[PDB]
Design a protein around this ligand. Sequence first.
Ligand SMILES: C[C@@H](O)c1c(O)cc(O)c([C@@H](C)O)c1O
Ligand SMILES: C[C@@H](O)c1c(O)cc(O)c([C@@H](C)O)c1O
Lengths: 205, 210
Amino acid sequence: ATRLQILEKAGELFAEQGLANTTSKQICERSQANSAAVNYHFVNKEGLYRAVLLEAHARLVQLETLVSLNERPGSPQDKLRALITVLVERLHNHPDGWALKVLTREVLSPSPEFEVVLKEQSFPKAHILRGLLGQIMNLPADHPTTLRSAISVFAPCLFLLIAHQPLKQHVLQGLSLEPQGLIDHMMSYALGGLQAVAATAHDAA
Amino acid sequence: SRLDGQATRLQILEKAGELFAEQGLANTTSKQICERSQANSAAVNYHFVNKEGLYRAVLLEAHARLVQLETLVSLNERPGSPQDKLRALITVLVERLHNHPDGWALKVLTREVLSPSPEFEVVLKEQSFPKAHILRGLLGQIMNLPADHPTTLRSAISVFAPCLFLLIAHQPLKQHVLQGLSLEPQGLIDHMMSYALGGLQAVAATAHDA
Ligand SMILES: C[C@@H](O)c1c(O)cc(O)c([C@@H](C)O)c1O
Ligand SMILES: C[C@@H](O)c1c(O)cc(O)c([C@@H](C)O)c1O
């Protein structure tokens, strides 16, 4: 509970100010925990920051959730639809959170904790997506066309999660963020794009 | 000697850009900008009025570096199919990726999206909106839908986001997430064009039957 409270408040502060502009003292005030209770649970600020980035990644989408939807019966098209659904619903239920802010800050100015998150969270999660796209296209999960398709499929969800508000009110005025309409668009678009790049890969080979 | 005044304005703009990208608006002082640019406070205020006016110019320059509005307008009015024009637009973004892996433009714009200053709305209305409007007009032509049809609006995200994600995250993706990823420009552009036209045809089919 003290561990989770420290994690939550440090997440909010790192999202607002970034690691460089965040003090051990600010974290203790917002958290209302002592320096020694921080040092006990997280060793130091760098260890707490690592825990924050790992939590932030889990809040975007839990690896256990992806494994579950990957292992249940269904066509890879149905599983893709459930994976997309997860990201789109995050847009509807957490438009406000700190997780994507702290991850985006990390991509712009990588700390030494960045590799850990990329290896333990980003890799296996992308891997599950690559295995679904590979089945849909009949290509290996690490085929260059599958690697590029992962960007094609995941990036639109990530852009919406980060930029929904300036998009809806200044750039794409009239954009509905109603989840079903976005899921349907993303699924129809992805299956059409994956069919087209699969065709060229299968003629090259 | 106007050219020499432009040099001083641009010198301060470049160093300010680099600093705002590294630190953000809240943690960057006028004394830092003066030291990095090696120009005095009066030279800064001369060119930009004040620090907030300099921040605005940095964000507008950042967006212009990503893709110039003029470049989109020129490719938009040339003769050729909307598919050709979309390929030229995508080529501009992938060439940005290939020639500017380590710039400041996208870092300062991203920080703005995360924690908007009062200058952000200006970039959105004067840079984002018209550049997205030219994209929407090409996707609409491709799908035979109005440029403000909801499918056109969503398809703008579907086409532009993969470019943005690559401009911001190319290095972690190639090194740790999508190892083996080839960011060779011709193959990226070919992939983006094949994928988009397949996806655009699929959502156009559902919009025209609905
Ligand atoms: C959530 C998961 O689908 C994911 C992720 O968490 C990070 C990432 O980089 C990728 C891309 C590259 O496919 C992903 O799919
Ligand atoms: C450059 C242009 O194509 C662009 C841009 O500069 C910002 C933006 O948000 C969008 C999206 C929404 O279409 C864009 O297309």
